[PDB]
Every structure is written in structure tokens, then in C-alpha cells.
């Protein structure tokens, strides 16, 4: 989302191109869809008929979270235990698997009696 302060008597216009061309919205607080990298927008405000100086904004885009690191494909004998874990640090973990296995942990509860 983009934003602009409220000015009495003002109309608003946003542009995607400095030089005041390629208008994109005449709302005060328009949205931006599908950002994949850093991008800029230009706000030009006009009160009583006079345009303001152009005021640019930059929308900063956060990098891709890299894939979680897991053990290579392993192999247990029936009766042994399946100990899953990940080496990466996160705010939240979400695991799922066979037999309804579900967990929220860096180191999930170990399955103590492996079976088919």
C-alpha cells in the first residue's frame, strides 16, 4: 500500500515515471500489486489548481526466504526411532507427514516406534 498525507483542497495523483507521465492512480492512498523487487512511485499533490513538487517514495522488498535444510533421505528399521530436525533458525516451523505427523518445532518430537 502507498500513502499520502491529507491536505485540505487537494486532489492527488500518483505516477510511475518521474517527468510526470504514466499516471497510475488519483486516490490518496492507492495500492501496488505484485512487487518482486524495490520500486518507486511519485506523488504530485494539487490544491486550488497548483501542483506541488513531486515527492517520491521507495517500496523496499524483502528477499526470498531460502529453503529449509533437512537430512538427506534416510532409512530406519522397524522398532527404531525417526528423529527429524532442521539446522536453520526461524520464527516459525511447520512440519507435516505420514500418519498425520504434525509439528511446530526446530526439533520435532521423535517417533519412537517406527513402523510401516
Amino acid at each position: 500500500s502507498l500513502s499520502a498525507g491529507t491536505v485540505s483542497g487537494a486532489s492527488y495523483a500518483w505516477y510511475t515515471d518521474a517527468g510526470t507521465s504514466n499516471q497510475f492512480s488519483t486516490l490518496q492512498n492507492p495500492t501496488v500489486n505484485n512487487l518482486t523487487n524495490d520500486s518507486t512511485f511519485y506523488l504530485l499533490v494539487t490544491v486550488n489548481g497548483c501542483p506541488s513538487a513531486l515527492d517520491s517514495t521507495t517500496v523496499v522488498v524483502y528477499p526470498l526466504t531460502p529453503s529449509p535444510s533437512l537430512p538427506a533421505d534416510f532409512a530406519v528399521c522397524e522398532g527404531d526411532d525417526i528423529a527429524l530436525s532442521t539446522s536453520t533458525v526461524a520464527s516459525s516451523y511447520d512440519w507435516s507427514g505420514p500418519n498425520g505427523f504434525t509439528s511446530n518445532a526446530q526439533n520435532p518430537v521423535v517417533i519412537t516406534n517406527a513402523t510401516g
Partner: peptide, 22 residues
């Protein structure tokens, strides 16, 4: 002699799931 206004910016409430309202 009035004056033609700009285009109140038209839009909608995002993508809509087939079969529902918008």
C-alpha cells in the same frame, strides 16, 4: 461553462473465486 473533473479512480475488490460475488 463548468469544467470536466478527473477520473475518480475505478477499481474492484481483488480477484474473485469462480461462482461468488464481488
Amino acid at each position: 461553462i463548468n469544467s470536466i473533473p478527473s477520473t475518480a479512480s475505478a477499481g474492484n475488490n481483488g480477484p474473485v473465486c469462480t461462482g461468488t460475488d464481488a
